[PDB]
Curated annotation (Swiss-Prot), chain A:
The lineage of its organism: Bacteria, Pseudomonadati, Pseudomonadota, Gammaproteobacteria, Enterobacterales. The C-terminus (residues 341-390) is not required for either 50S ribosome subunit association nor 70S ribosome dissociation. Mg(2+) binds at S173, T193. One of its GO terms (molecular function) is guanyl ribonucleotide binding. This is GTPase ObgE/CgtA. The gene is obgE. Residues 127-147 are annotated as: Disordered.
UniProtKB/Swiss-Prot annotation, chain B:
This is Large ribosomal subunit protein uL6. It comes from Escherichia coli (strain K12). The gene is rplF. Belongs to the universal ribosomal protein uL6 family. The modification N6-acetyllysine is found at K43. GO terms for cellular component: cytoplasm; cytosol; cytosolic large ribosomal subunit. The lineage of its organism: Bacteria, Pseudomonadati, Pseudomonadota, Gammaproteobacteria, Enterobacterales. NCBIfam families: L6_bact.
Swiss-Prot record, chain C:
It comes from Escherichia coli (strain K12). It comes from the Bacteria. This is Ribosomal silencing factor RsfS. Belongs to the Iojap/RsfS family. Keywords: Cytoplasm, Repressor, Ribosome biogenesis, Translation regulation. Functions as a ribosomal silencing factor. Interacts with ribosomal protein uL14 (rplN), blocking formation of intersubunit bridge B8. Prevents association of the 30S and 50S ribosomal subunits and the formation of functional ribosomes, thus repressing translation. Member of a network of 50S ribosomal subunit biogenesis factors (ObgE, RluD, RsfS and DarP(YjgA)) which assembles along the 30S-50S interface, preventing incorrect 23S rRNA structures from forming. Binds to late stage, pre-50S ribosomal subunits where it contacts ObgE and enhances the latter's GTPase activity. Addition to isolated ribosomal subunits partially inhibits their association, preventing translation. GO terms for biological process: cytosolic ribosome assembly; negative regulation of ribosome biogenesis; negative regulation of translation. It is found in: Cytoplasm. It holds the Pfam family RsfS.
From Swiss-Prot, chain D:
Keywords: Methylation, Ribonucleoprotein, Ribosomal protein, RNA-binding, rRNA-binding. Belongs to the universal ribosomal protein uL11 family. This is Large ribosomal subunit protein uL11. It comes from the Bacteria.
Length: 338, 176, 102, 141
RNA sequence: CAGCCAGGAUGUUGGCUUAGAAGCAGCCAUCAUUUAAAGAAAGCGUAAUAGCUCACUGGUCGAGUCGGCCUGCGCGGAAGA
């Protein structure tokens, strides 16, 4: 129930330690063995999954962090302690981009795994390691190689198998007033929403029907009361995608003759991402007549050019959604990921 | 300073007994007695009270105005009384009064029994309302604070014990 | 008292779709358990609910369970009532273990 | 013009038939029906003309219906079809886009039935120009 | 002077290469009547109608009050076995 956000942070990989050059007196002993050991290997920033949070402000509040430099070698052949690896917790579904090779090292799907984004450097070599008789005086110093300069660009994509997008006040936010437990601030006035809402559906024994929401817009690059354009970002990861159509508005846009435009904003972004499956399910039938409804549904579905099976339920009153629940659940069990 | 020079008027029926630096405001609604640092002398003039400092100490008017201020609380408390109202916001929050023991249900693992002081009377007009009545503003303020300190209103939803006049701010932080 | 609780537990589990119910009698074979009842669970969510169900009727029936095992893993889980011990198991996971050999 | 009960006003014009994309059903939702546009809203507007947006107040206390009185249209919608340009400035102040004159817009501002600030006439003739000259116009006083 | 009791408005939801903006990251002149005073502007801050306060004016007690600098002597800066 709070405003979405995303940003990027500046993280510098830990650089390796430096070799140590040291000579020592002992009591009345002028000349002794070379003193000074290795340095400290640089830190390794890690990415931990976050299931028990959804916040991203911890990236604007703290933008620059430095992994501790590997401590220089000390006397008495004391090597430098490895810099502690700082773990940056990240919410699930954050694809990472780099300045340069703008390809993702790996998408974050499960909870409880760690991914390396910047390996630490290499420790230096002290003069003790360089003991020899060719020089007969080990005093040269070998500095540690700096860690890799990786810059992270973070965008969040929510994990949900089913997502809601549709016309204003058409029931996209009302869809969660179903058997789901989430209750976003939904009504019957323009756009009903600013923040995406997520809800779960318990069916039977580990079968899940997490529902995603996005606030759509009008005719693409247009808006009614300042609603943003870049809200398709949280979508585009749903294996099953549903769409709602405004039915008999008091003064709103006409029937499916306007839905020819609705085809466009799916492919507007780049390509609709290989034309993910789309089912045209209707809503708000409780205030209409079913005997009046079949002639519209026979006309709405076919005027656009869609001939597949159309689902006709009233999500406003939360009745008849069960057959969708079984059928969609049937889709996953009959079509796993491959 | 100018507060000390401002006279305070006492209504009829409230006796003032001066025995040096101890002053009694016994009247219609109880008995109150306080002591000073001896830095202010009170003058028994006509039906009002005036205050003044003495030479030798630098504080002077600073504490002189206080004695006028504190006595203002006592005179009203013995003829009108101070009323403090507190309300419970949230599900599972219950308050009740039995004798001089105040019982509260704030989601803890056990009901909390709070003992009131000598000069405070508390009542519950409804299930989620507490009203405090007393003769001294000093005691009623601490008791009202003491009830508030148990479940201080957390900003996010305001669930807890709050003052009636105090307003709680609801803010959206830690998005999602 | 054993027969009464045996009836009390077999009825409750069947009320929430508990299939493949077999009541064993290990009297004499072993000196730890009096009666043995076995159950089948399809997957993790509902078998935990069965464990949640039986433990909360036990608290409402007076008898306090003295030990449970299933934590962060629903392949096996046990709820104990003293004389009678219930074993709710996954169907796929049971076949690795024995059935009516205890 | 008394108190709370949240007077609201939303219109874009009276010529058409209450379109949603510009305003929507936001013309009242606390006891005001949306279908009342063709019974009392179109009671005196249809008798004269439909070419000017008009503000409306709700004034509903406990009744199913409404008890307001219509008033004058705003002073900015009169610069489209009766005085000049229909779109606007374009460039705000890079040059002088539009032009107005004293001879223009003298009787149009007097068509207001009852919306006055004082009884003086010449005081209000230079009050109507407040809307103008704020968008990069020229005065021909 | 600060308190307390009231006002805080009219074009005006100011139009504008304004994707919504009715005071707010853009946009401009920064003007124009009624009045005792009120800004196309002070803010906590909603997708906005919004909720409320303030810049100034009036009344109330009535004689001091308002906000800048120099300077001796004082406090913090000043934690180790």
């Amino acid at each position: 129930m709070k405003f979405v956000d995303e940003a990027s942070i500046l993280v510098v990989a830990g650089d390796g330690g430096n070799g140590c050059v040291s000579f020592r007196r002992e009591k009345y002993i002028p000349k002794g063995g070379p003193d000074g050991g290795d340095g400290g290997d640089g830190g390794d920033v890690w990415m931990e999954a976050d299931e028990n949070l959804n916040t991203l402000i911890d990236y604007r509040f703290e933008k620059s962090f430095r992994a501790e430099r590997g401590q220089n070698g000390a006397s008495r052949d004391c090597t430098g302690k490895r810099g502690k690896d700082v773990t940056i917790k990240v919410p699930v579904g954050t694809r990472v981009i780099d300045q340069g090779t703008g390809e993702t090292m790996g998408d974050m799907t499960k909870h409880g795994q760690r991914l390396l984004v910047a390996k630490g450097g290499w420790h230096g070599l002290g003069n003790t390691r360089f003991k020899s008789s060719v020089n007969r005086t080990p005093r040269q110093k070998t500095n540690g190689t700096p860690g890799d300069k990786r810059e992270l660009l973070l965008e969040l994509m929510l994990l949900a198998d089913v997502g809601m997008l549709g016309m204003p006040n058409a029931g996209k936010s009302t869809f969660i007033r179903a058997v789901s437990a989430a209750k976003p601030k939904v009504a019957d006035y323009p756009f009903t929403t600013l923040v995406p809402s997520l809800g779960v559906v318990r069916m039977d024994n580990e079968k899940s029907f997490v529902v995603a929401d996005i606030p759509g817009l009008i005719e693409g690059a247009a808006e009614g009361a300042g609603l943003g354009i870049r809200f398709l970002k949280h979508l585009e990861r749903c294996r099953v995608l549903l769409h709602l159509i405004d039915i008999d508005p008091i003064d709103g846009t006409d029937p499916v003759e306007n839905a020819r435009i609705i085809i466009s904003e799916l492919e507007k972004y780049s390509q609709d991402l290989a034309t993910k499956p789309r089912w045209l399910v209707f809503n708000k039938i409780d205030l209409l007549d079913k005997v009046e409804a079949e002639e519209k549904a026979k006309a709405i579905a076919e005027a656009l050019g869609w001939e597949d099976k159309y689902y006709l339920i009233s999500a406003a009153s939360g009745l008849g959604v069960k057959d969708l629940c079984w059928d969609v659940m049937t889709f996953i069990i009959e079509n796993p990921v491959v | 300073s100018r507060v000390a020079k401002a006279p305070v008027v006492v209504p009829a029926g409230v006796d003032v007994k001066i025995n040096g630096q101890v002053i009694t405001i016994k009247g219609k609604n109880g008995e109150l007695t306080r002591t000073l640092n001896d830095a202010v002398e009170v003058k028994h003039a006509d039906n009002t009270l005036t205050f003044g400092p003495r030479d030798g100490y630098a504080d002077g008017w600073a504490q002189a105005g206080t004695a006028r201020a504190l006595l203002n609380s006592m005179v009203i408390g013995v003829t009108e009384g101070f009323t403090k109202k507190l309300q419970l916001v949230g599900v599972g929050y219950r308050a009740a009064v039995k004798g001089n023991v105040i019982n509260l249900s704030l989601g803890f693992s056990h009901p909390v029994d709070h003992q009131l002081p000598a000069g405070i009377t508390a009542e519950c007009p409804t299930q989620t309302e507490i009203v405090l009545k007393g003769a001294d503003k000093q005691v009623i303020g601490q008791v009202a604070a003491d009830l508030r300190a148990y479940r201080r209103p957390e900003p996010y939803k305001g669930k807890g014990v709050r003052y009636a006049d105090e307003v709680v701010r609801t803010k959206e932080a830690k998005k999602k | 008292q054993g027969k009464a609780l045996q009836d009390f537990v077999i009825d409750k589990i069947d009320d929430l779709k508990g299939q493949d119910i077999i009541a064993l009698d290990v009297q004499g074979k072993s000196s730890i358990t009096d009666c043995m009842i076995i159950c089948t669970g399809t997957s993790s969510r509902h078998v935990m609910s069965i464990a949640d169900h039986v433990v909360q009727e036990s608290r409402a029936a007076g008898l306090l369970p003295l030990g449970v095992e299933g934590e962060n893993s629903a392949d096996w889980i046990v709820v104990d009532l003293g004389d009678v011990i219930v074993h709710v198991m996954q169907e796929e996971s049971r076949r690795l273990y024995e059935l009516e050999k205890l | 013009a008394k108190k709370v009960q949240a007077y609201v006003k939303l219109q874009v014009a009276a010529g058409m038939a209450n379109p949603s994309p510009p305003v929507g059903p936001a013309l009242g939702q606390q006891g005001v029906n949306i279908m009342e546009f063709c019974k009392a809203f179109n009671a005196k507007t249809d008798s004269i003309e439909k070419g000017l947006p008009i503000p409306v107040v709700i004034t509903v206390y406990a009744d199913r219906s409404f008890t307001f009185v219509t008033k004058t249209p705003p002073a900015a919608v009169l610069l489209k079809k009766a005085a000049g340009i229909k779109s606007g400035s374009g460039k705000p102040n890079k040059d002088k886009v539009g032009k107005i004159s004293r001879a223009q817009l003298q009787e149009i501002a007097q068509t207001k039935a009852a919306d006055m600030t004082g009884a003086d006439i010449e005081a209000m003739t230079r009050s109507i120009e407040g809307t103008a000259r704020s968008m990069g116009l020229v005065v021909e006083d």
